[PDB]
Design a protein around this nucleic acid. Structure first.
Ligand SMILES: [Mg+2]
Ligand SMILES: [Mg+2]
Ligand SMILES: [Mg+2]
Ligand SMILES: [Mg+2]
Ligand SMILES: [Mg+2]
Ligand SMILES: [Mg+2]
Ligand SMILES: [Mg+2]
Ligand SMILES: [Mg+2]
Ligand SMILES: [Mg+2]
Ligand SMILES: [Mg+2]
Ligand SMILES: [Mg+2]
Ligand SMILES: [Mg+2]
Ligand SMILES: [Mg+2]
Ligand SMILES: [Mg+2]
Ligand SMILES: [Mg+2]
Ligand SMILES: [Mg+2]
Ligand SMILES: [Mg+2]
Ligand SMILES: [Mg+2]
Ligand SMILES: [Mg+2]
Ligand SMILES: [Mg+2]
Lengths: 88, 129, 218
RNA sequence: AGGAGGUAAAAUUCU
RNA sequence: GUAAAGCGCACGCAGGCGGUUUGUUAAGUCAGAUGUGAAAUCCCCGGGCUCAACCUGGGAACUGCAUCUGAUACUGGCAAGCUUGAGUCUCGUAGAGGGGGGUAGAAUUCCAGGUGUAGCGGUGAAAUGCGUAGAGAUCUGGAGGAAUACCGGUGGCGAAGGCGGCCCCCUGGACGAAGACUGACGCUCAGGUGCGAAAGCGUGGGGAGCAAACAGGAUUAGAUACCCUGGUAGUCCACGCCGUAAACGAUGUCGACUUGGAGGUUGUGCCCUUGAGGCGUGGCUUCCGGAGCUAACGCGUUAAGUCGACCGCCUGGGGAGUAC
C-alpha cells in the first residue's frame, strides 16, 4: 500500500491542511496514485490473480465515491479529475 | 439491518421479553419514541426514557405478569419493501378487539382502537397483543 | 443475618446460567452466593410450611447419595412425617397405584422379624428373608405407616433428586428444596439456595425445617 | 501403564 | 442442511432498499365534497300467473374512476445538517494470501568404476521379469527429475478453487490500538466482468517416480478385472485454451437481537517485569450444550432461534439437465 511516508505529499493542495485525511478528494488521490504505480506490478508477474482482486476494490471504491460527490457540490469534481488525469 | 429500525425495535423487545430481560437500550428516532408512547398509553410496557444526548438512546422497561410477558405477540406489518396503508372504514381488529394495531396518520401516530373514534387512517405499523 | 457460619456457596464451573439473579460470587472459582436472598427465601419457605403443618400437613424428607445418608433418618421419624434414604424408586408416588403394595411385603415380614414366625422354619430362610427386610428398610422407611398423598416433600440436592422434583411437579404436590450453584431451579416453587454438599451445612437446613414443622399446632 | 508394527484371498445363483 | 430447491466464488450497472435532525412541498398516504360508475343480472323487502320456475315495484350493491378542498404523522422530492453505518490517515501484529528469482537437504532411478558370488524380486501361493558380461548386497564418484520428512496442531491464510523446506524483490487482504479527517459516501444485485481442483486441448520444452492405454505373468467357470513384471499419454515448466466436481457445511450476502461450559489461536488497554503474570477488552476459531426451531436426525450467539433489506432457486417419480 505504497509508503507510509508517501501520501504525505498528496494530502496538501487536495486537502485544506495536512491530517485532513478524509476529504473525498484525497482518498481518490491516494487510490489513483497507488493504482497507477501498481499497474507496474501487474506488468511483470501478471499471473498474480489474487493481488489484482485487491486492485479492483481500489478501482471500484474510487469510482463508487467519485460518484458520491457528483451528487453533492457540483464541479467539486470537474476541479479534480483533470487535476489528476482520469475521465477517459 | 438499520434498514427497518422500527422492526428492529419490535425485535429488541420481542426476544427481549422472551429472554426475560429487565428492559432494553436502543437508538432513538423521533418516531420510535412516538410508538413507545402508545405502548406506554396501552400498558405493554411500564414506561420509556429517552436517555438522550446528541446520540439519543431510548431505553424502556419490562412488563410481566404471573410469570409471563404482557406482550404475547408483537410483529411488524407494514414495512420498507412493502408499505401498507388502510382507509378509515377498513382497518384491522387485532385479536378481534383485545390488543391493538398501531397506525400512523395525518394526526401523529395513534392506535386502531383510537384510529376510528377519531375517524381517519394511515400506515399500519405493527400488531401488538 | 448470617446465622450459618462456615457454609457460603460451594461447587464450581457448572452453574445454571438461569441462577444469576441470586449469587454475588467469584472467589478462586467456587462462586459464593447472596445470603440475604437465601434467608428471606427461608422466611417465606421455612415460614409457609406451618400454614400447612397446621393443616395437619404431611411432608416428606428426601435425601440420598452416600453422604449424610441417614443424617435424614432422625427426628424425621417424628417430625410429623418420615423420610426416604437410598435411591429414588421410579414413581413411588406417581405409581403409588403399585409399589404401595411393597410396603406390604415389608410390614408383613417386619411383624415377623419378631411376631409369629421369625425363626420357626429353616435357618436358610435365615438370611434370605431378612435380606428382603434388609434391602428395602434402607429404601422405604419411606412410608412405614403413612396416610394421605404426601403433600410437599423436602429434598436436599435439587437435581440429584432429578426424579423426585419432576414427579412432584407432575402430581401437583408442592416442592421445598435447596439449590447449590449448578442445579436447575425451574421446578421448585420454594427454592432455598445455599449448598447441598457438606455434612455440616446440610444438617442446618435439616435441623431448621425439622423445627418449625414439629410445632404444627400442638 | 501410551504409542508401533503385523494378523480374514479368489468364491456366482434362487417364477 | 439430509425430502424437489442456495448460482463453485467474488466485483459491480440498472433496479429494489436505507441511518438521524430540522425545516419545505403535497407525489404517495389519509378525510370530506361533488360528479360518474347504462339497463338488465346477483342480494334484501314486496306484487303477480292456482304454487313454483318465471314476470314485476322499490331499495342496497356496482369492492371503482375522475375533479375540487383539506389534513401532513409515515414514504418520496427539494434544502440545509448531524456522526453512530461506511471510508480515509497513523504505528504495529501474526499468517502455507498471491506473483518472480534464488538455494538447501533426505530419498527413488539411472551412468562409471571397486570388492563380492548365486541368487534377486515378487505373491495368498506363484510365475512373468532381473542374474554367470556378475544380479540383488556393499563402497566411492557423477548425472537428472519430482516432492519438501521432523516442525504440523479439531494450527493459520484465502472470496471460493485452494495455499506447507529455506532465502531476498513485488504485492493483496484481515486484525489491534489511540486520536485525526470525511459526513450516509450505504446494503443487495437480474444483466455484465473476472477467479475458478482434477482430468482434458494446443504449441513447444521436460521426464526421477508414479501411472490411464497397451503387453506379459497369475487368478477364474469365464477374468477384457482386483494381484504381480513392465509400461505410453499424463502428472512437471512456459504461453493460450477449457469453465466443470459430493466446487459441500449439500446451509446465498448484509445488519441487528436472545442463558451457558471447556478450550484453540492472534491482538491490544490498564495495575509491585514483581512469573512462564493480576485485571480486562478486540478479531477469528474447535467441541459441548438452554431456550427456541425442527418431520425427525439434528441446529443451538460462527443458528437451522428472533427479525428486517435484497438476490438465486423448488412445485410428484420418470422422460431430462435430454432434443431443438
Ligand atoms: Mg453371494
Ligand atoms: Mg442366471
Ligand atoms: Mg436434495
Ligand atoms: Mg455456495
Ligand atoms: Mg425509510
Ligand atoms: Mg305469489
Ligand atoms: Mg346497475
Ligand atoms: Mg421527508
Ligand atoms: Mg551414490
Ligand atoms: Mg541433484
Ligand atoms: Mg502487508
Ligand atoms: Mg481463468
Ligand atoms: Mg491439469
Ligand atoms: Mg500438454
Ligand atoms: Mg452445475
Ligand atoms: Mg472443498
Ligand atoms: Mg453442539
Ligand atoms: Mg457461546
Ligand atoms: Mg440465519
Ligand atoms: Mg446439454
Amino acid at each position: 500500500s505504497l509508503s507510509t511516508e508517501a501520501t504525505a505529499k498528496i494530502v496538501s493542495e487536495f486537502g485544506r491542511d495536512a491530517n485532513d485525511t478524509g476529504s473525498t478528494e484525497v482518498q481518490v488521490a491516494l487510490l489513483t496514485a497507488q493504482i497507477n504505480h501498481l499497474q507496474g506490478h501487474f506488468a511483470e508477474h501478471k499471473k498474480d490473480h489474487h493481488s489484482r482482486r485487491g486492485l479492483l476494490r481500489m478501482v471500484s471504491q474510487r469510482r463508487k465515491l467519485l460518484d458520491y460527490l457528483k451528487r453533492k457540490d457540483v464541479a467539486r469534481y470537474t476541479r479534480l479529475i483533470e487535476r489528476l488525469g482520469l475521465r477517459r | 439491518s438499520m434498514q427497518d429500525p422500527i422492526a428492529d425495535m419490535l425485535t429488541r423487545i420481542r426476544n427481549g421479553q422472551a429472554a426475560n430481560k429487565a428492559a432494553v437500550t436502543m437508538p432513538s428516532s423521533k418516531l420510535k419514541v412516538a410508538i413507545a408512547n402508545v405502548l406506554k398509553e396501552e400498558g405493554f410496557i411500564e414506561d420509556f426514557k429517552v436517555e438522550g444526548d446528541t446520540k439519543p438512546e431510548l431505553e424502556l422497561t419490562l412488563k410481566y405478569f404471573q410469570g409471563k410477558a404482557v406482550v404475547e405477540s408483537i410483529q411488524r406489518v407494514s414495512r420498507p419493501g412493502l408499505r401498507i396503508y388502510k382507509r378509515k372504514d377498513e382497518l384491522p381488529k387485532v385479536m378481534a378487539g383485545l390488543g391493538i394495531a398501531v397506525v400512523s396518520t395525518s394526526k401523529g401516530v395513534m392506535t386502531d382502537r383510537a384510529a376510528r373514534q377519531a375517524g381517519l387512517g394511515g400506515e399500519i405499523i405493527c400488531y401488538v397483543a | 443475618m448470617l446465622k450459618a457460619g462456615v457454609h457460603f456457596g460451594h461447587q464450581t464451573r457448572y452453574w445454571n446460567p438461569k441462577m444469576k439473579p441470586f449469587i454475588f460470587g467469584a472467589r478462586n472459582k467456587v462462586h459464593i452466593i447472596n445470603l440475604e436472598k437465601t434467608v428471606p427465601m427461608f422466611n417465606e419457605a421455612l415460614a409457609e410450611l406451618n400454614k400447612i403443618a397446621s393443616r395437619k400437613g404431611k411432608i416428606l424428607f428426601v435425601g440420598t447419595k452416600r453422604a449424610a445418608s441417614e443424617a435424614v433418618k432422625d427426628a424425621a421419624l417424628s417430625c410429623d412425617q418420615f423420610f426416604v434414604n437410598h435411591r429414588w424408586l421410579g414413581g413411588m408416588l406417581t405409581n403409588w397405584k403399585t409399589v404401595r403394595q411393597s410396603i406390604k411385603r415389608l410390614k408383613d415380614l417386619e411383624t415377623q422379624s419378631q411376631d409369629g414366625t421369625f425363626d420357626k422354619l429353616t435357618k436358610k430362610e435365615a438370611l434370605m428373608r431378612t435380606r428382603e427386610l434388609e434391602k428395602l428398610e434402607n429404601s422405604l422407611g419411606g412410608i412405614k405407616d403413612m396416610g394421605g398423598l404426601p403433600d410437599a416433600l423436602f429434598v436436599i440436592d435439587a437435581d440429584h433428586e432429578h426424579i423426585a422434583i419432576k414427579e412432584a411437579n407432575n402430581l401437583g404436590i408442592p416442592v421445598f428444596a435447596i439449590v447449590d450453584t449448578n442445579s436447575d431451579p425451574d421446578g421448585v416453587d420454594f427454592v432455598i439456595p445455599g449448598n447441598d454438599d457438606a455434612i455440616r451445612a446440610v444438617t442446618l437446613y435439616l435441623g431448621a425445617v425439622a423445627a418449625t414443622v414439629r410445632e404444627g399446632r400442638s
